[PDB]
């Protein structure tokens, strides 16, 4: 009897606490598509090839819909495409926004606006010679743009400000300050969903709409209590517009964190128990430094979360059996993934780097990151097959696009933690499109069994239809 073994999600035990955990695929994305007896396959994440050389590691990215170009902060420089257009001080992640007249960067507690004419301004109070209101402009944490105004949050004081309509280098003349105010504190992040200013605190997410007032001093924004979410975000960059709302990671102020997508006044969990355990392995710090982003290609709608030790990708287009998660990494020994700050421009997806002063372009006919061969994992769930004596381990692989006859390390575990002997079986061949990857004689199953299916390639890996004969 032939039995099909799923490979899109594995299963095992954690030897630290003897609990059951999922084994996520590494450098693999699941694509639901009926190929043959399969109804889905697994394809390696696209590799990275060098595009440009920059001043340092990437610190921010945005698509400038005004200039129709991608602006990247790298090291101490700000680039419009390939050419440097400004100097940015600091060393960490920066906020990025833009409008008609300038590209704004939130860095070092400042909202530095690089105008397209070549001048650089900074948001500051109106001069006292003006008859205009002066505000307590402290530090800047996060910035955003809406309706021709920059809205930014003051660091740790629950307040946010907007810029003037005819002068974006100053706050509003009469009514610039607003507060979330349905909370003791928390203004961690700021964004714009559809036409609202969204203030992401801890334990609250608040929405603000334009009032349409005309009288001087009247409030230009009003909170919408019907749209507010009773949950917060862990860090200033722990949120992204994913599908039509914001996906975020919750603050410890409301319990153990996980991954949520905002619905209508509520948040729906996206993370599984294994993802929650991975998140819980981090302190409150190392969790506020996580960076979230989104990717879109070939009907793939990926949500990428970078942590100091993990890069976790959630696929919303392949989550028909529950949330679909995978791990991105660089190297062969669980080193963190180096790609960050993805952005689609022209007809290519371009990324920054976490460790080198370079930029990539995410080539699709390879799987190596900057010419370095990468590792891919595909586990199968444990199953009870006492005295089964399995045979004919078959997998379907799409061969032909390869530079070497790269192989497959096939091993089996019988306790859920430790894997045994690895056999090397050729899984690809250059210019050969009919290969039949297969291992005839698998051993006898005593109580339990599970397979690892490790590959190391510079070429794309496409695997589907894992099957065994159990006799």
């Amino acid at each position: 009897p032939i039995q099909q073994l799923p490979m899109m999600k594995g299963m095992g035990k954690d030897f630290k606490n003897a609990d059951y955990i999922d084994y996520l695929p590494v450098n693999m994305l699941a694509t639901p598509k009926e190929i043959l007896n399969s109804s889905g396959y697994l394809r390696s994440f696209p590799g990275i090839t060098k595009r440009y050389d920059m001043n340092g590691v990437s610190r921010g990215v945005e698509y400038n819909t005004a200039q129709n170009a991608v602006y990247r902060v790298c090291g101490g420089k700000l680039y419009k495409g390939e050419s440097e257009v400004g100097d940015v001080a600091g060393s960490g992640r920066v906020s990025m926004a833009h409008g008609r007249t300038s590209q704004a960067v939130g860095v070092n507690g400042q909202l530095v606006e690089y105008r397209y004419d070549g001048t650089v301004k900074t948001v500051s109070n109106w001069p006292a010679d003006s008859g205009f209101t002066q505000y307590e402009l402290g530090s800047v944490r996060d910035i955003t743009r809406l309706r021709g105004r920059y809205a930014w949050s003051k660091d740790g004081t629950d307040s946010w400000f907007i810029t003037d309509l005819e002068d974006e280098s100053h706050p509003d003349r009469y009514s610039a300050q607003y507060r979330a105010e349905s909370q003791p504190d928390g203004i961690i992040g700021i964004g714009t969903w559809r036409d609202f200013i969204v203030c992401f605190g801890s334990s609250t997410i608040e929405y603000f709409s334009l009032t349409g007032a005309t009288t001087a001093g009247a409030a230009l924004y009003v909170a919408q209590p019907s749209l507010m979410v009773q949950k917060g975000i862990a860090g200033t960059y722990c949120k992204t517009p994913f599908a039509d709302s914001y996906a975020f990671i919750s603050h410890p102020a409301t319990g153990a964190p996980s991954v949520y997508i905002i619905g209508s006044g509520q948040a729906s969990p996206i993370a599984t128990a294994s993802i929650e355990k991975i998140i819980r392995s981090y302190t409150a710090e190392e969790m506020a430094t996580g960076v979230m982003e989104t990717l879109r290609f070939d009907s793939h709608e990926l949500l990428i979360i970078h942590l100091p030790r993990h890069v976790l990708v959630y696929d919303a287009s392949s989550s028909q059996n529950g949330p679909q998660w995978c791990v991105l990494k660089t190297g062969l020994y669980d080193d963190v993934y180096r790609g960050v700050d993805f952005m689609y421009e022209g007809n290519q997806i371009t990324c920054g780097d976490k460790s080198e002063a370079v930029v990539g372009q995410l080539q699709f006919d390879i799987s190596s990151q900057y010419d370095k061969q990468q590792e891919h994992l595909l586990f199968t769930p444990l199953f009870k097959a006492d005295n089964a004596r399995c045979f004919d381990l078959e997998v379907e692989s799409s061969t032909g696009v390869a530079q070497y006859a790269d192989r497959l390390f096939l091993s089996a575990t019988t306790d859920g933690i430790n894997y045994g002997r690895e056999q090397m079986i050729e899984q690809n061949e250059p210019f050969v499109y009919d290969k039949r990857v297969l291992w005839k004689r698998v051993g006898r199953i005593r109580r339990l069994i599970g397979f690892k299916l490790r590959v190391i390639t510079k070429s794309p890996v496409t695997l589907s239809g894992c099957q065994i004969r159990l006799e």
């Binding site: 030897f15 669980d334 306790d415 933690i417 430790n418 002997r421 005593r446 690892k452 490790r454």
Partner: protein, 118 residues
């Protein structure tokens, strides 16, 4: 500098009276100069995996027909601390070998004192 020697992994354990592997033999690893059979003197032993994780395993290590350490009939890599004593018993319970300190079997014993002196 070629300071790494191409040696044999999966160490081989042989019977002390004949040229034969200690099939189904038991190995205990413990503190230096002690009886490792007593669980009070035993020290952790770890399986080293492909992924790099080290998983502590039950102390009596099983030797197969080839003279090698196996876990579930599978050849594994077993690691511990540098200073340990080893006891090897046959499948019938007879003592095959005892070593009070493995570090004293290194070919060069001047290295330890030279390192601790200068």
């Amino acid at each position: 500098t070629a300071n790494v020697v191409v040696s044999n992994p999966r160490p081989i354990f042989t019977e002390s009276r004949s040229f034969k592997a200690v099939a189904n033999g038991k190995i205990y690893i413990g503190q230096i100069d002690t009886d490792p059979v007593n669980p009070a003197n035993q020290i952790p032993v770890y399986i080293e995996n492909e992924d790099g994780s080290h998983v502590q395993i039950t102390q009596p290590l099983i030797i197969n027909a080839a003279g090698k350490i196996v876990y579930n009939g599978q050849l594994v890599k077993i690691v511990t601390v540098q200073g340990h004593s080893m006891a090897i018993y046959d499948a019938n319970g007879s003592q095959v070998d005892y070593i009070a300190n493995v570090l004293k079997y290194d070919p060069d014993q001047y290295s330890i004192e030279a390192d601790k002196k200068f």
